[PDB]
């Protein structure tokens, strides 16, 4: 698959000279962090997401890696790359607009959006698992599975994003450059290992955020790291029911416990004891069915 090349100046124009103000005030800034800033734009009669990246060589390597993974990987649960820009000063990546932003922002009800129902959350969990399965089937390791990297479209379909740090398989490799988000990382990933088993662990943290509506890490909280609730539940100090997001009216105990069981399995500290993505996908499908 080949992408439409965009002029840097057309992208600069449609994003109101890369306006870093929120949409609420009259700016184009939608979000940031993914080794760049994502702005709202309007190209070839469509609303778009323009990612302005953002060592300069390491950032360009992430730019090429995203294009390479996007050229090979086309799936309904992955973000769709429309084109890129390299001609100007900054490196730009153009995507199909995801009106519902990120799963992280929707779980926190950022900007006054209504809480996601249990029914929508079940669909998002299944969709995100289908996207990870597609990546693993095609021998790709994401390396940064988190709620901020799960986008939501006009129908709340889960779309995995940010393939800049993605790695090929088609074992277990080691690296000197340890990348990812701490609160979501498997123990071995924090040590330098590169394995698809690390994506499973991070997805387990995502499932906990979906059940609880709580961020993976919170400074003003006990436990500070969401993954530690697994121990509280296993040591009968608490139950998953004590953790269920109260911003839902349609959550039943059975399906919540079925999703928690998947999360708990994903969160096994020993990489080889975790289920593979196909098993995760099967278990999440059985939950609804």
| Least distance (Å) between residue 288 CB and ligand 4GD | 26
- Which residues, 245 to 274, sit near ligand 4GD by CB under 6 A? none
Query: What residue is closest to ligand 4GD based on CB?
Result: 31
Nearer to ligand 4GD, 149 or 264 (CB): 149
Could you tell me which of 25, 21, 58, 57 has the C-alpha nearest to residue 37? 21
**Subset of residues 75 to 94 that bind ligand 4GD, contact rule: CB under 6 A:** 79
Both tokens assigned to 154: 């006009």
The answer to whether 150 contacts ligand 4GD (rule: CB under 6 A) is no
Residue from 12, 41, 51, 267 in contact with ligand 4GD (CB under 6 A): 51
Among 11, 30, 92, 207, binds ligand 4GD (CB under 6 A): 30
Instruction: Sheet with 92-96: list strands edge to edge.
Output: 4-5, 81-85, 92-96, 46-52, 37-43, 29-32
Determine whether 144 is an active site residue: yes
- Find the catalytic residue in 87, 89, 90, 144: 144
Annotated binding residues for ATP: 30-38, 51, 146-149, 162
State residue 126 phi and psi, 5-degree precision: -65, -45
At its nearest, how many Å lie between ligand 4GD and the CB of residue 234? 33
- Name 193's bridge partners: 174
CA trace torsion 10, 15, 18, 21 (10° rounding): 170
Binding-site size for ligand 4GD (CB under 6 A) equals 17
> Other CB atoms closer than 10 Å to residue 19's CB: what's the count?
15
Of 61 and 285, which has the nearer Cβ to ligand 4GD? Answer: 61
Binding residue numbers = 30-38, 51, 146-149, 162
Are the C-beta atoms of 283 and 258 separated by less than 8 Å? yes
* Tokens coding 99: 């009106």
50 interacts with ligand 4GD by CB under 6 A: no
C-alpha to C-alpha distance for 88 and 188, rounded to whole angstroms: 39
Question: What tokens does 252 get?
Answer: 């039943």
**CA 107/CA 116 separation, integer angstroms:** 7
Nearer to ligand 4GD, 131 or 197 (CB): 131
- Whether 217 and 226 have beta carbons less than 8 Å apart is answered as yes
Q: Is 125 in the site for ligand 4GD (CB under 6 A)?
A: no
**Residues at the site binding ligand 4GD, with contacts judged by CB under 6 A:** 30-31, 34, 38, 49, 51, 79, 95, 97-99, 101-102, 105, 148, 151, 161
- For the annotated catalytic residues, the residue numbers are 144
């Amino acid at each position: 698959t080949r992408f439409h090349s965009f002029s840097f100046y057309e992208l600069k124009n449609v994003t109101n000279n890369f306006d870093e103000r929120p949409i609420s005030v009259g700016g184009n800034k939608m979000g940031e962090g993914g080794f760049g800033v994502v702005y709202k734009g309007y190209v070839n009669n469509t609303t778009v997401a323009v990612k302005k990246l953002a060592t300069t060589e390491e950032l360009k390597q992430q730019f090429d890696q995203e294009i390479k993974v996007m050229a090979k990987c086309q799936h309904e649960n992955l973000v769709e790359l429309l084109g890129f820009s390299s001609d100007g000063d900054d490196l730009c990546l153009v995507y199909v607009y995801m009106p519902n932003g990120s799963l992280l922002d929707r779980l926190s009800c950022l900007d006054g959006t209504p809480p996601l129902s249990w029914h929508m959350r079940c669909k998002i969990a299944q969709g995100a698992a289908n996207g990870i399965n597609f990546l693993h089937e095609n021998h790709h390791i994401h390396r940064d599975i988190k709620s901020a990297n799960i986008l939501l479209d006009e129908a709340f379909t889960a779309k995995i994003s940010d393939f800049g740090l993605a790695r090929a398989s088609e074992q277990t490799v080691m690296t000197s450059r340890i990348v990812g988000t701490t609160a979501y990382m498997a123990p071995e990933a924090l040590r330098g290992e590169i394995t698809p088993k690390s994506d499973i662990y991070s997805f387990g943290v995502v499932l906990l955020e979906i059940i609880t509506g709580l961020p993976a890490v919170d400074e003003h909280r006990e436990p500070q790291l969401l993954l530690d609730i697994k121990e509280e539940i296993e040591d009968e100090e608490k139950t998953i029911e004590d953790y269920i997001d109260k911003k839902m009216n349609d959550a039943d105990s059975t399906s919540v416990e079925a999703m928690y069981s998947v999360a708990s399995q994903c969160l096994h500290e020993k990489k080889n004891k975790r289920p593979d993505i196909k098993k995760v996908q099967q278990l999440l499908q059985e939950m609804t069915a």
